[PDB]
């Protein structure tokens, strides 16, 4: 019974299940390693059923929920062992939430039919303010300022949070107990986005100081700092490869970083309302890029503040395809509020026709790894599902989910079932205010809660 | 922590070896000894330490690399 024989037993037992489940076996084994080849291999968009989606909204006591991170155990083909931390956690799905109330909360979402169930939480406060006032001494266990982001380790052993307190605290998943605090050691280094490398302990942190920081959670140490962004790095995404992508907000540049090569690729939208009109013979120029998600190791998507969702390919610096005003136009300001004059016509003139109208922003944008479908979010009141073309040159609107009402700060998706039949659950954090701050006016009907939608797959 | 990266890897069966350029990131540290780098390169390449050779290490101005 040498270790090699054990792998043979597990491999033989694994193969028997595939035979029981089912040419088909040969294709299935190839799909197991399709992740290593960084190409899209999950064509299920047409087989999705949005219309029959079971939508539900779960209110949460926390005010203005800021982000959501979900953990899914995955069977490792190399060792045939689940990624669950312990045997108790076998096939248990966890989702972690952060808010500006300085509270971290975990929920169990294993039961697709049932709503998220709270298990444990940890809350911060003024107790955790550092006395030293030095950056390197900002090693307090709990948070003392707004929490902006959360990420769950792929191994299911740790969950990490970061915010404007300029700290990276990593918590134990089971008890939400802080085990290490990693100060950024920068005056303006507020954490804005966190992304775990898929099936790895490497973490990429985007900070307000115009830098990206890399960490090793198993080792609890900082590794490298990346430079090149001219403005705040608002969002970051990563896949199995080390090729993380980021967006610089007002600088209007999307950046792909090759960590091994120590090189960077610069992408710029370069669209002008002026030219879009003559080719037509309302177009809003992009102001900032706020969201990004990597559809593929060789493709990614971005969302701007002008309501433009753009598809990108590494070969081309310019966008390959764009979807202008994806989420529609904001409601026109009321004429009884624009001006104080008695005559109604005078007030209408202040509206200046349609020229004051502005588009919705893409607050959230998430793509399932190596798939042809991605989800976009805003405060329009609906989550839109898009399907990408087979040639990866364009995408179309697959459908919408109107259950969500409020600001979609972050979107996550989890799957369960057999390799043939899967049910997808879309979990989106909903808040009454934008994650970065309180700019946006209050949205009528907005509530703070976790939006859930279970989509069954048939064809 | 310390990171070791290898680039420009050329297989040289004429001398029966592999040639490469080694970049060492050592924040908050002076620099890394040749024996230590040989050990880690041996671990990465799955070869004896005796079969690993390292040289020509210059720390860049400002330190850390």
């Amino acid at each position: 019974e040498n270790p090699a024989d054990k792998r043979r037993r597990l491999a033989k037992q694994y193969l028997e299940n595939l035979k029981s489940e089912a040419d088909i076996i040969a294709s299935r084994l190839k799909e197991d390693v399709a992740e290593q080849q960084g190409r899209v291999f999950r064509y299920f968009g047409d087989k999705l059923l949005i219309s029959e989606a079971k939508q539900s909204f779960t209110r949460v006591g926390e005010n203005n929920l800021t982000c959501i991170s979900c953990f899914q155990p995955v069977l490792n083909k190399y060792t045939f062992e689940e990624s669950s931390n312990g045997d108790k956690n076998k096939g248990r799905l966890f989702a972690y939430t952060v808010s500006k109330d300085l509270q971290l909360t975990k929920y169990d979402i294993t039961d697709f039919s049932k709503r998220p169930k709270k298990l444990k939480y940890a809350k911060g406060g003024a107790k955790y303010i550092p006395t030293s006032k030095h950056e390197y001494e900002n090693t307090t266990e709990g948070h003392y300022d707004e929490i902006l982001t959360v990420a769950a380790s792929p191994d299911g052993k740790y969950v990490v949070t970061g915010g404007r307190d300029r700290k990276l605290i990593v918590w134990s998943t089971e008890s939400l107990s802080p085990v290490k605090v990693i100060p950024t050691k920068d005056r303006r280094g507020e954490v804005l986005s966190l992304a775990f490398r898929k099936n790895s302990d490497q973490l990429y942190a985007s900070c307000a100081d115009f830098k990206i920081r890399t960490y090793s959670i198993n080792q609890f140490s900082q590794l490298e700092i990346l430079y090149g962004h001219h403005d705040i790095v608002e969002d970051i995404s990563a896949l199995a490869m080390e090729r993380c992508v980021t967006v610089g907000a007002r600088d209007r540049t999307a950046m792909l970083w090759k960590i091994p090569d120590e090189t960077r690729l610069t992408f710029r939208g370069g669209d002008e309302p002026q030219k879009l009109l003559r080719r037509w013979m309302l177009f809003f120029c992009e102001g900032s890029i706020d969201v990004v998600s990597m559809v593929d190791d060789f493709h990614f998507i971005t969302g701007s503040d002008n309501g433009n969702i753009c598809l990108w390919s590494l070969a081309k610096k310019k966008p390959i395809f764009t979807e202008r005003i994806a989420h529609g136009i904001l409601p026109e300001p009321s004429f009884n509020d624009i001006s104080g004059e008695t005559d109604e016509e005078l007030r209408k003139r202040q509206l200046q026709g349609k020229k004051l109208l502005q588009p919705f922003w893409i607050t959230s944008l998430y793509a399932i790894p190596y798939s042809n479908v991605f989800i976009s979010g805003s405060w329009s009141g609906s989550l839109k599902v898009w399907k990408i073309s087979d040639n990866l040159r364009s995408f179309e609107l697959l459908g919408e989910l109107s259950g969500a009402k409020g600001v979609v700060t972050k979107i996550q998706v989890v799957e369960s079932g057999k390799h043939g039949k899967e049910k997808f659950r879309i979990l989106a954090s909903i808040a009454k205010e934008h994650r970065l701050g309180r700019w946006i006016a209050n949205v009528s009907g907005a509530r703070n809660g976790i939006y859930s939608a279970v989509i069954d797959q048939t064809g | 922590a310390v990171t070791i990266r290898t680039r420009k890897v050329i297989s040289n069966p004429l001398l029966a070896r592999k040639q490469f350029v080694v970049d060492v990131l050592h924040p908050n540290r002076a620099n890394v000894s040749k024996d230590e780098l040989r050990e880690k390169l041996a671990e990465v390449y799955k070869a004896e330490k005796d079969a690993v050779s390292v040289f020509g290490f210059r720390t860049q101005f400002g330190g850390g690399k």
């Binding site: 080792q219 091994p260 | 990171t3 880690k40």
Partner: peptide, 19 residues
Amino acid sequence: PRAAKKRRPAAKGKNLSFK
């Protein structure tokens, strides 16, 4: 006659972190 087809690099960078 056509020139020999280019051969991809056999070796690629490998990475490790410690202490």
